[PDB]
């Protein structure tokens, strides 16, 4: 009926309001994430066919929104405008839990359904998909809430039907909103790239074990009987990894060989580098209690760590990477790679199927979403300021929207 | 009966001589490959259990022997001595065709059998193999004739039984000896790494198409209905690739972006680099006749070419590499790798199964071993001098031993 | 513009007529296929979104239409009516070549495009598909032209976009229309069920080698270097299989153990049965020239042949079956199946991807569609009468519609 | 030193006695398992190369020994004699836990090592294995203790090195001896046949859930997040399945359609049969709480149950079977199999790798071996008499040999 509802409120189920509250970034306030976000009123986008409107109960936090709020080196608002967009703002957020509130044509999902979203859109009619491509790898794939405007930091969100998954009942709205992009991504890294998937007895090296990705990965690895070794930068983060089921941890502050690889011709430099990697390898042996290499290395740290990751992975093993926190130069020593027949695999979010499987595991209580802290809607900036300053807590964080839980 | 037979001759079938002619490298004559090899008399190693003695009819040529003959940067003779070896020489060669002449205990292979060898040894009792590892990827794997002494540049060779494959009848001894390490390696690159194996309609980028690896790869790709695009450095090498079934070719001399990747932070440098890679990508489009990316990139060229290879491979595609001709720094732009979910796969020689399958294809006449030139036994040095000076002909080369064909 | 065009004619490109000529079955004339089909005028169905209208140039022939024309044991017209259909007729045909003539909304395919169709429809929005199911295996899958009315025996046909594949240029309209369901189905059987796909050196047993399925299968197997052994019921059909690249053939008339398996408790009966299967196995050895079992058995013959097929398949081999010509009781001796760890795989038509790959192979001239005979539009009945009476020629047959080639 | 040691005793570690106590079957006492076994003194077989002598601490029980003790329909003693064996007795047992006591040449395993054995032997030099065959599927594979004499019902046992796996520390000798053939076999059924392996959210139908196979399977399925539905013949067996993590159970006594399939031509019979299978399918829906089919059906029951299993499995699902308790006629309705593209997979024991993985899961406490009852060495007959009379308890049973735990 009405055009605008305050946070926590909604029109009659099955109907959409004309407007809504959402947290916007604008070019004029690019900068500190704490200054970048402001709550405004905006029009609610239309609910086209195959789509549904979700009453957003809580939204997750991530790195993407930090870079969006900075503007550098990519003005996402300006980028979209150069692609035909008329918005002079950006609504971020690429995780949510909520309630289907209205649906478009062709949709089978009924108003009232409780859902968690995988923030990936693709064209279900795309030729590569129709010929057997995994949609998240399709040419038409893009991250909702980051590459596309009108993400989850909004009272309502329009999504495609295939993007929805059943909210695990036992979870709070906040916890149900914090895990999907992080957990699903880790799940794909570990179980999505046959034949290099974690098996019982497999040692796994997990960079940033106390982080969002790593928190889920440690659990996933221990769950199927693998042996998780975590990399941390503090004793407390180490203990947290032990809480999650880690065999043990390695403190990266012990080493100084991190970074780009020298010219493989620079013999002196390489030997010096090798000493660093071997020392790291020793620690790994000491944590594991045996002289084995990780069959799989979970990467995302990128430039500083990739050369070590390549060295560490077992013969016929895999380094699988979904990001580049410390930079995008992945320097590979090809001798390690080809002679031992190792795999460096790029990975990015997850498939619908994988989103569903990890949701089931969490629903059943096998995996914990690791909700570390919940923020209010006016604290979206604060929360992203934490990440930016690398002051965020271990695990995953969330933001209440229409919910009180 | 007798202790020594001249080249072309042999004791009674089923028996081993005490000595033999072979082509040796010695530390005192490390250097120019043409000076490095000399024919000498040496003791014939014992034929232990599981092993067989082969009367060597012809032996193949490769890069390994060139580096062995140079001594730098790895004194293979000194290396082996530090591992307990008593030889003060090195007999190279990692390809042969020949006749089983005597067999050890447990061997089912009968004297008289005509064989081609895959020059890879491993421990059939190794725990990783017994637990399902692919033997060529095992911790106990090593290249016979390069990492191990007493290779194929000898009148007789002792090999393990599992190393033998039926010589294709229709082939000369020279042709049957030239293909295995090269063809089998290319076959594994293209068909050994599911799910990234060449399918009908798949475009494939093949570096060094006119070389040994590339010659086989072009044929293999066209055979299963794929679309081979070759990279060459001359018009004549381009035409040769067309002879083999290539859609077309790209001349690498057209470009100057080759080499290590700049810091991904060096924006100017990267854009300049990207211009180079995009120009290369244009040529590829023009050869293919359509705007598609290679699903698989066959690599081996290494440092100069890997960044381009990474850029070129399709979403969810694979770059598979078995060497580093131009250097061992494989610089990866992680954004290309993770966002498009690409695979960089190390590959090294082949499995027994793969050696057999490519042998069958050649036996049936589907694939040509591309024997380019045959040398006499005293020309082993000359032939390796050619490779060293990059003056060798397209395709694969061989050396007569006991044979006249 | 106009409402009706005679065969061979069409409205302006991009437009649809209101009516068309098509060949109908009606309940009142169920029976002999030669009496069952009659050419009538009918309304042209609407071209909804995602769909396109095709000017049908030629249509393929198959078993399905024979059973449709008989009415027994399934009145397809009555069946559909019980599912809400208002038609009192049935237009069959599940293969066509033709020209896109008009398109619905969301379609990227342009009028003028020449296409071959895979006669399988599914719901691209189905949850099982979205969660990673192969669409042809989906709960919403069905054969266009058989389970659905308005198949290809019509001047125009409405299809879904994903159903279209590029017509191979070098083919006549008749040849381009005859192969898809048959070739694609065989292709899936042989290459669609990893890890049991044909590899170089693999012997393959192919029932009905001179038929449509078998004609393509023999070629596909020989193409990747496998060894095709064909089963036929006549010397001439044997020679035809030799034409296609078969190693040799087996004459099934030599044996009398065909049919359902006796109770495995009936020792006498089973030994008698085993004698039959062993004799068949001997012939297979004699054709192959060695004592090996087929790694893959291409089935479709069904009840009479399945017990033999199960016995014949190699340890860890596969029997893959897409039909039951002689009946639907597939009697398995579980001892053969479990002790040798064999796979009995059901298979049905093909995926879009597989339709495309086999089309590419045919386009490139690696595979011949084996067009055996072409009929005129008024001979649809005659052609199906042949199949019914088992008097049809080897290979695949087609029917001209708007075309003269 | 000495030639014979009483049960519980042994020569100096590293040495073998000339004789030993073992439980023998002899032809003269074929019949009731309780009469068939008698403890005698026998020579200890030699410890050839690659082999090790194990001081047997406990041995597992199974079906095989029951059929061995009956003699019908296969005189295993006479069979072996016709293959050249000189023994006039048979020592059964195909599971053990124990201590490596002496080793042959080439063995790396050291005296003192605690081991569990996978009772499968194969020729590590076999050509099919060397060309990539899974050894348990090899032509040279056979079950130690059943197809071969001198199994585990003996004070000492000679095994091949590859057959040994680390005993899980936390287990009693009895528990460590009872699980391997049963657990490993179930593990292969569920995780060994890609792409049909249990995934999170997968419903799985498990015949005989309270038995040895089923006990492990229920746990394995629930462990990876699947949904186990058990088939039992009593309320108490149902509750036991609930103990193991089952969603629920089905009572097979409710149905009477069990057995061989009628002729698919016998319409009346088939409809009657279908009513039975649909009723079974209803119960499955009611247990699951939703209208889904099992993605995987764990079979072994055989003739009575296979037709139902085939009907039940999901589109593109798998029925995997490792036995035929109720008979060896696996009657398949091919229409269900091909139209829904289902897989009927034979499976038999396990690979070394799989034995190791399930051992790791049990070692870590994720899976319980379900030791139901332990017998003394003179009760081997009694225990097998139970199985024979179908009076054995749920789970797995074991027999003490040299151990008191
Ligand atoms: N779909 C996708 O592509 C996807 C999905 C999720 C995440 N990601 C990416 O993956 C990365 C991690 O995400 P996240 O959510 O886990 O972030 P997070 O919660 O902050 O965890 C990242 C962890 O990385 C470790 N780290 C930071 N700098 C490092 C260095 N120089 N060397 C080694 N380790 C270092 C830190 O732990 P310690 O200080 O304890 O070592 C940090 O906690 C981000 O770059 C993110 O953008 C991508
Ligand atoms: N088991 C194994 O690991 C294995 C097996 C076989 C080969 N390999 C390795 O693979 C590499 C190629 O072997 P091959 O036998 O094919 O040697 P080859 O016959 O000499 O072919 C190599 C080709 O690489 C191309 N190339 C050279 N420099 C290049 C550059 N800077 N950029 C781009 N392309 C360049 C050349 O062709 P154009 O000048 O026409 O471009 C050359 O013909 C060698 O490094 C070898 O050691 C490894
Ligand atoms: N998508 C699908 O599910 C799909 C697709 C294509 C075909 N199919 C089915 O596959 C079957 C074959 O199709 P098709 O197009 O190849 O038909 P086809 O051209 O008639 O070939 C079938 C061949 O089967 C052989 N055959 C007949 N009776 C036999 C018996 N009692 N024992 C052994 N062999 C016998 C015959 O050859 P000989 O007399 O020379 O032995 C006959 O030529 C049909 O039942 C069809 O419905 C299914
Ligand atoms: N490597 C191998 O090939 C391998 C390994 C292990 C087992 N097996 C075979 O698998 C089968 C089961 O072994 P197991 O150790 O689990 O034996 P088990 O412990 O006795 O369990 C078998 C269960 O099957 C069920 N069953 C019996 N008759 C049935 C019928 N007519 N219909 C449906 N279900 C029935 C029974 O449970 P309810 O009465 O509660 O239904 C019984 O408890 C045996 O035939 C065995 O030889 C083979």
- Kindly write down the DSSP assignment for every residue of A10-63, as one continuous string: -SSTT---SEEEEEEE-GGG-SSHHHHEEEEEEEPPP--TTEEEEEEEEEE--H
Residue D393 CA: which ligand is closest? 4
Report d(CA D14, CA D107) in Å as an integer.
13
Assigned token pair, D362: 């049990």
Task: Give the sign of the dihedral formed by CA A115, CA A119, CA A120, CA A124.
Answer: positive
Helix (H/G/I), strand (E/B), else coil: C356: helix
Helix (H/G/I), strand (E/B), else coil: C244: helix
Q: Is D327 in the pocket of ligand 4 (CB under 6 A)?
A: no
Helix (H/G/I), strand (E/B), else coil: B268: helix
A304 known ligand binder: yes
Give me the residues paired with residue D229 across strands.
D205, D248
> CA separation (Å) from B125 to B133, B139, D51?
12, 12, 12
Other Cβ atoms less than 10 A from the Cβ of C105: the count is 9
> CA separation (Å) from C267 to A195, C172, D131?
44, 56, 37
Helix (H/G/I), strand (E/B), else coil: C246: coil
Task: Give the sign of the dihedral formed by CA C80, CA C85, CA C91, CA C94.
Answer: negative
Pocket of ligand 1 (CB under 6 A): A 63, 181-182, 185, 207-208, 210-214, 231-233, 237, 252, 300-301, 304-305, 322-323, 325-326, 348-349
Report d(CA D96, CA D94) in Å as an integer.
7
Q: Which helix (H) or strand (E) holds A142?
A: strand A142-143
Q: Which residues on chain C are in Cβ contact (under 8 Å) with A127?
A: 108
> CA separation (Å) from C183 to C178, C225, C359, D219?
9, 18, 9, 43
CB D379 within 8 A of CB B154: no
* Look-up of token digits 């995996």: A367
CB D157 within 8 A of CB D59: no
CB A189 within 8 A of CB A298: yes
* Look-up of token digits 């002999």: C32
All residues at 6 or more sequence positions from A112 whose CB lies less than 8 Å from its CB, including other chains? A13, A99, A100
Closest CA to D177 of D391, D386, D383: D383
Report d(CA B186, CA B166) in Å as an integer.
19
Q: How far, in whole angstroms, is CA C289 from its chain's centroid?
A: 31
- Kindly write down the DSSP assignment for every residue of A273-326, as one continuous string: HHHHHHHHHHHHHHHHTSS---SEEEE-S-TTTHHHHHHHSPTT-EEEE---TT
> CA separation (Å) from A291 to A217, A250, A255, A299, C355?
22, 16, 20, 21, 49
Q: How far, in whole angstroms, is CA A339 from its chain's centroid?
A: 33
Q: How many angstroms separate the alpha carbon of residue B63 from the centre of ligand 2?
A: 9
Domain boundaries along the sequence of chain A? 1-405
Closest CA to C147 of C93, C98, C70: C93
Report d(CA C383, CA C389) in Å as an integer.
10
D343-346/D318-321 β-pairing: parallel
Q: Is C121 in the pocket of ligand 3 (CB under 6 A)?
A: no
A to B CB pairs, distance under 8 Å:
143
Beta strands in D213-342 (DSSP E): 227-232, 248-251, 296-299, 318-321, 329-333
Q: Which helix (H) or strand (E) holds A130?
A: helix A127-130
Assigned token pair, B17: 């001589």
Q: Which residues on chain D are in Cβ contact (under 8 Å) with C338?
A: 321-324, 346-348
Q: Which residues on chain C are in Cβ contact (under 8 Å) with B226?
A: none
Give the nearest chain D residue to C128 (CA atoms): D315
Closest CA to B362 of B374, B353, B370, B352: B370
State the structure-solving technique. X-ray
**How many CA within 13 A on the CB side of residue C80?**
21
Resolution in A: 2.2
Q: Which residues does a gap of C–N over 2.5 Å follow in chain B?
A: none
Name the minimum distance, in Å, from the CA of D156 to any CA of chain C. Answer: 28
Report d(CA A242, CA A253) in Å as an integer.
18
Chains contacting C (3+ CB pairs below 8 angstroms): A, B, D
Contact C357 B225 (CB under 8 A): yes
- With vertex at residue D116, the alpha carbon angle to CA D110 and CA D120, rounded to the nearest 5 degrees, is 105
Report d(CA C162, CA C117) in Å as an integer.
9
CB A222 within 8 A of CB A200: no
Closest CA to A334 of B277, B211, B347: B347
Report d(CA D32, CA A215) in Å as an integer.
58
CB B321 within 8 A of CB B343: no
D237 known ligand binder: yes
* Look-up of token digits 């071997």: A278
Report d(CA B188, CA B346) in Å as an integer.
11
CB D343 within 8 A of CB C344: yes
> CA separation (Å) from D62 to C35, D33, D156?
63, 12, 19
Q: Which of A301, A329, A347 to mutate to test the interface with B (most CBs of B within 10 A)?
A: A329
Report d(CA D182, CA D33) in Å as an integer.
21
CB B176 within 8 A of CB B167: yes
Contact A131 C356 (CB under 8 A): yes
CB C340 within 8 A of CB D347: no
Give the nearest chain D residue to B352 (CA atoms): D131
Q: How many angstroms separate the alpha carbon of residue D230 from the centre of ligand 4?
A: 12
Report d(CA D129, CA D350) in Å as an integer.
15
Beta strands in A173-254 (DSSP E): 203-206, 227-232, 248-251
Closest CA to D63 of D400, D383, D369: D383
Report d(CA D107, CA B125) in Å as an integer.
9
CB B380 within 8 A of CB B151: no
Instruction: Order across the sheet with B343-346: list the strands.
Output: A248-251, A227-232, A203-206, A296-299, A318-321, A343-346, B343-346, B318-321, B296-299, B203-206, B227-232, B248-251
Assigned token pair, B332: 């990866």
Taking an 8 Å Cβ-Cβ cutoff, which residues of chain A contact chain D? Answer: 194, 199-201, 224-225, 356-358, 360-361, 364, 366
All residues at 6 or more sequence positions from B254 whose CB lies less than 8 Å from its CB, including other chains? B279, B283
Q: Which residues on chain B are in Cβ contact (under 8 Å) with A134?
A: 316
Report d(CA A330, CA B342) in Å as an integer.
13
- With vertex at residue A51, the alpha carbon angle to CA A162 and CA C140, rounded to the nearest 5 degrees, is 50
Report d(CA B204, CA B222) in Å as an integer.
10
Beta strands in D247-307 (DSSP E): 248-251, 296-299
D392 known ligand binder: yes
Q: Which residues on chain B are in Cβ contact (under 8 Å) with C361?
A: 200, 225
Closest CA to B330 of B352, B353, B301: B301
Q: Is C65 in the pocket of ligand 3 (CB under 6 A)?
A: no
- Kindly write down the DSSP assignment for every residue of C48-73, as one continuous string: -TTEEEEEEEEEE--HHHHHHHH--S
Angle, to 10 degrees, between the axis of helix C352-363 and the axis of helix C180-191?
110
Chains contacting D (3+ CB pairs below 8 angstroms): A, B, C
Angle, to 10 degrees, between the axis of helix A352-363 and the axis of helix A180-191?
110
- With vertex at residue C183, the alpha carbon angle to CA C181 and CA C185, rounded to the nearest 5 degrees, is 60
Which residue lies with its CA nearest to atom 43 of ligand 2? Answer: B211
Closest CA to D172 of D378, D395, D393, D374: D374
Nearest by CB to residue A352, choosing from C125, C131, C351, is C131
Q: How many angstroms separate the alpha carbon of residue C132 from the centre of ligand 1?
A: 29
Q: How many angstroms separate the alpha carbon of residue B372 from the centre of ligand 3?
A: 48
Name the minimum distance, in Å, from the CA of B363 to any CA of chain C. Answer: 10
All residues at 6 or more sequence positions from C248 whose CB lies less than 8 Å from its CB, including other chains? C229, C230, C238, C242, C287, C288
Name the minimum distance, in Å, from the CA of C195 to any CA of chain D. Answer: 8
Q: Is B208 in the pocket of ligand 2 (CB under 6 A)?
A: yes
Assigned token pair, A321: 């990477």
Nearest atom of ligand 1 to the alpha carbon of A215: 16
Q: What are phi and psi of D180, to 5 degrees?
A: -65, -55
Report d(CA A334, CA A294) in Å as an integer.
18
All residues at 6 or more sequence positions from D354 whose CB lies less than 8 Å from its CB, including other chains? D184, D187, D188, D191, D192
Angle, to 10 degrees, between the axis of helix A212-223 and the axis of helix A352-363?
70
D248-251/D227-232 β-pairing: parallel
Report d(CA C402, CA C155) in Å as an integer.
6
Helix (H/G/I), strand (E/B), else coil: B331: strand
Helix (H/G/I), strand (E/B), else coil: B298: strand
All residues at 6 or more sequence positions from B282 whose CB lies less than 8 Å from its CB, including other chains? none
Secondary structure tally for chain C: helices H, strands E: 13, 19
Other Cβ atoms less than 10 A from the Cβ of A215: the count is 30
């Amino acid at each position: 009926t009405k055009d605008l509802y305050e946070l926590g409120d909604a029109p009659p189920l099955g109907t959409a309001p004309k407007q809504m509250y959402a947290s916007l970034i604008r070019q004029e306030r690019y900068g500190r994430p704490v200054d970048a976000f402001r709550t405004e009123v905006v029009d609610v986008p239309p609910v086209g066919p195959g789509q549904v409107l979700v009453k957003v109960m809580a939204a997750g936090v991530n790195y993407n929104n930090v870079w969006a709020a900075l503007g550098e080196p990519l003005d996402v608002i300006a980028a979209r405008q150069k692609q035909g967009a008329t918005e002079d703002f950006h609504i971020g957020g690429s995780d949510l839990s909520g309630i289907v509130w209205a649906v478009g044509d062709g949709v089978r999902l009924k108003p009232g359904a409780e859902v968690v979203v995988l923030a990936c859109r693709w064209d279900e009619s795309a030729q590569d998909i129709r010929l057997g491509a995994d949609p998240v790898t399709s040419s038409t794939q893009r991250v909702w809430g980051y590459e596309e405007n009108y993400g989850s930091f909004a009272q309502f969100a329009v999504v495609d039907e295939y993007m929805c998954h059943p909210k695990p009942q036992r979870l709070s709205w906040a916890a149900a909103s914090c895990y999907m992009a992080t957990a699903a991504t880790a799940y794909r890294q570990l179980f999505g790239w046959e034949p290099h998937t974690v098996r019982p007895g497999d040692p796994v090296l997990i960079w940033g074990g106390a982080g969002g990705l790593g928190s889920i990965a440690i659990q996933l690895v221990r769950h199927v009987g693998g042996i998780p070794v975590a990399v941390v930068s503090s004793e407390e983060r180490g203990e947290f990894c032990m809480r999650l089921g880690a065999k043990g941890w390695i403190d990266r502050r012990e080493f100084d060989h991190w970074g780009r690889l020298p010219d493989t011709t620079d013999e002196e430099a390489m030997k010096q580098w090798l000493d660093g990697a071997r020392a790291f390898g020793r620690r790994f042996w000491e944590v594991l209690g045996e002289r084995r290499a990780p069959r799989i290395v979970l990467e995302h740290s990128g430039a500083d760590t990739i050369p070590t990751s390549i060295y560490m992975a077992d013969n016929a093993g895999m380094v699988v990477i979904c990001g580049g926190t410390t930079g995008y130069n992945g320097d590979v020593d090809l001798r390690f790679l080809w002679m031992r027949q190792k795999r460096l695999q790029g990975s990015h979010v997850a498939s619908a199927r994988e989103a569903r499987e990890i949701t089931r595991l969490i629903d059943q209580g096998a995996i914990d979403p690791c909700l570390s802290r919940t923020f209010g809607f006016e604290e979206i900036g604060l929360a992203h300021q934490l990440i930016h300053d690398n002051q965020h807590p271990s695990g995953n964080m969330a933001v209440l929207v229409n919910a009180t839980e």
